Amino acid sequence: EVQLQQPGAELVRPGGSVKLSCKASGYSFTTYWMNWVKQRPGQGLEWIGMIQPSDSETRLNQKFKDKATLTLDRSSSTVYMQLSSPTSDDSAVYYCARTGRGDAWLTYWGQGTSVTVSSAKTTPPSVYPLAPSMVTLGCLVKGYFPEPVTVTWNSGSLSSGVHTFPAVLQSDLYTLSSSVTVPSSTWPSETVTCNVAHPASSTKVDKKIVPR
Amino acid sequence: NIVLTQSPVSLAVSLGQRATISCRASKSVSTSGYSYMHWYQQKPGQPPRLLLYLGSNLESGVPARFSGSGSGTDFTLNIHPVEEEDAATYYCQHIRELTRSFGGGTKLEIKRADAAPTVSIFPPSSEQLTSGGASVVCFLNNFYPKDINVKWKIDGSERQNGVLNSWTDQDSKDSTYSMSSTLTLTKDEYERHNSYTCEATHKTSTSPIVKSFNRN
Amino acid sequence: CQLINTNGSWHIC
Fold it and tell me: Does residue A141 sit in the same domain as residue A87?
């Protein structure tokens, strides 16, 4: 299956540099076009440019003339975008996407890399269990920087009845909560565990919700 | 550059009703028998999903309930019977020339019968108290319509400082909304009091839904 | 049939 691999996030000092990666698998790397798209969370899409892996032809959105450089590494099956002189304005999700045919429609998409341009520390979250027909449980993921965090319940197996709320920012530190609703018969009888990923610090925390 | 203008900015459509979304380009995106206009669907926290390419071709796996039409500078996204999972933002995008442009987006909200919030309150965990902190969490889950308010009370007195709220977009399975409210205190503060109360006021009822716990 | 430049290229009949 076609897959575009992108890191979860990039923390970048203003002025520093950052070079986003997109590793393609599941097809001959030297076919189609790889495109890069910018999006501030909450807002629209904006096209940065594309590279053709067969011959490295590039096309670039002249608004990013002096910001974006697109390159590649054939042996790595990886496409790159480097951003010059990162400011707070470059903080956004950057998706890579591959055309479905030729240079046209964007069939396949990476998950997106959230770039945060900031001096601040990299702080991992503290995860806290939240325990009290149907029963609601949760996890509080407190005190992390920068975004994002990924929450799953039971390694993915609890998909439904879940609510993972947008983070709030208070003092260069994000906090979010996740809720899960399961049947009473299911808990405490069965283990319920929230799994928290914080990519920018390479952290993965598991926390079982135990009754009081 | 071609500017792509969509309309409306957003729309609400009932669980069986019709959604029709429009996209106008600054100049033609047609050449030969091809219209280089494409449509995407996005739900929060995920990449866009290609729905339609070349004006009217459904991508593989995309329900027959989605249909596109148009020519030249005017394009139309139509959605057959609107299901709950269609709550999303929809984008048009052209492949005609270098500098691809997207439309500004159109958020589709689903219309729905009212539902009261399911309210749940949670004391600070033992792990948090160990660090000198004390967050009390309240979830107000699965309600419609989206407007809601939360009141915190400590030992019977309303409390305004230290609360932070977060809201979800419309749920893809039941078209409801949810909110989370956290009251962050210090351990010492938390330990000065006994009763902690979260009250939700929603259109569904004239009286707040109250949820409580006592330390001890 | 004609060649259309989107910026790769297409032959459309």
Answer: no
A127 plus A190 within the same structural domain: yes
Q: Are A179 and B178 in contact (CB under 8 A)?
A: yes
Buried b (16+ CB within 10 A) or exposed e, A154-174: beeebeebbbbbbbeeeeebb
DSSP state letter for A129: E
Interface probe with B: pick from C1, C2, C7, C9, most Cβ of B within 10 Å:
C7
Give the pairing of strands B19-25 and B74-79: antiparallel
Q: In this structure, are A127 and A100 located in the same domain?
A: no
Residues A173 and A198 in one domain: yes
A111 shares a domain with A22: yes
Q: Residue A65 corresponds to which tokens in the numbers above?
A: 């003339």
Q: What resolution in angstrom units was achieved for this structure?
A: 2.0
- A148 forms bridges with which residues in the sheet? none
CB-based contact A63:A73 (threshold 8 Å): no
Expressed as residue numbers, the domain containing A34 is: 1-119
Which residue among A119, A136, A152 closes a domain? A119
Last residue of a domain, which of A119, A142, A174? A119
- Residue length, chain C? 13
> Measured between alpha carbons, how far is A194 from A189 in angstroms, rounded to an integer?
16
Segment 97-136 of chain B within 8 Å of chain C by CB: 97-98
Q: Which residues of A touch B93 (CB under 8 A)?
A: 45, 47, 106
SS3 A147: coil
A126 and A202 housed in the same domain: yes
Pairwise CA distance, residues A10 & B126, whole Å: 33
